[PDB]
Amino acid sequence: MIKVEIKPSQAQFTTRSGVSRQGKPYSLNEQLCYIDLGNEYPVLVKFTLDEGQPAYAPGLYTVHLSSFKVGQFGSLMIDRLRLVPA
Amino acid sequence: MIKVEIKPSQAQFTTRSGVSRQGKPYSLNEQLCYIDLGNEYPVLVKFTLDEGQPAYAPGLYTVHLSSFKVGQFGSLMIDRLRLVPA
User: Fold this and answer.
1) Beta strands in chain A, from DSSP E residues, in sequence order
2) Contact, B4 vs B67, CB < 8 A?
3) Which of B29, B76, B81, B82 should be substituted to probe chain A, the one whose Cβ sees the most A Cβ atoms within 10 Å?
4) Exposed, middle or buried: residue B17 (CB in 10 Å: 0-12, 13-18, 19+)?
5) Do B81 and A76 touch (CB under 8 A)?
6) Secondary structure element (H or E) that encloses residue B32, with its range
7) How far is CA A79 from the centre of its chain?
């Protein structure tokens, strides 16, 4: 299991916006977290939330299986970091 | 935890080869596995082994933390699927 932490200072998201190739508006909500990758300190990671999802609250989380997909070259990839409470 | 299985038929690797942009030879060893991504059946996934590593033997495995890195856009990515026995 991957240990993810949302710190008190990371309790909010920011939103970026634009327009797709054929004219549709979009909005993407991004939040920050710390992930323990086995180095001397956890590292800062950004991720995009799914549509209609609030920012994750401060606390400890692990990564859900739905974060992963098989890519176009037949290998595993992360689609979007989706979290569940520890 | 991600559940990975090496079937009896997947006990071997194949090797691809070539030459880098400035002339150095390389070899990459690739092996297949099945990963349970929560769909009705496990899916077929290819991955490259690290240098000097034998093919994983048939059996059940999970993914090691060293499989992950922060990418150039600040988000989590899989570098190479590295496995450890379940």
Assistant:
1) 4-6, 14-19, 25-35, 43-48, 59-63, 68-70, 76-78, 83-85
2) no
3) B76
4) exposed
5) yes
6) strand B25-35
7) 9
For this PDB entry, the determination method is X-ray
**Cβ proximity of B32 and B12 under 8 Å:** no
Nearest CA in chain A to B76: A45
Question: Which member of A1, A35, A77 has the closest CB to residue B78?
Answer: A77
Distance, CA of B26 to CA of B16 (rounded, Å): 9
Sign, CA torsion B21/B22/B25/B31:
negative
Total structural domains in chain B?
Answer: 1
C-alpha span between B16 and B57 (Å, rounded): 20
CATH number, domain with residue A27: 2.40.50.140
Closest by alpha carbon to A5, among A33, A30, A28?
A33
Report CA torsion sign: B82, A35, A56, A78.
negative
Domain span holding position B70: 1-86
Q: What amino acid is encoded at B31 in this protein? A: Q
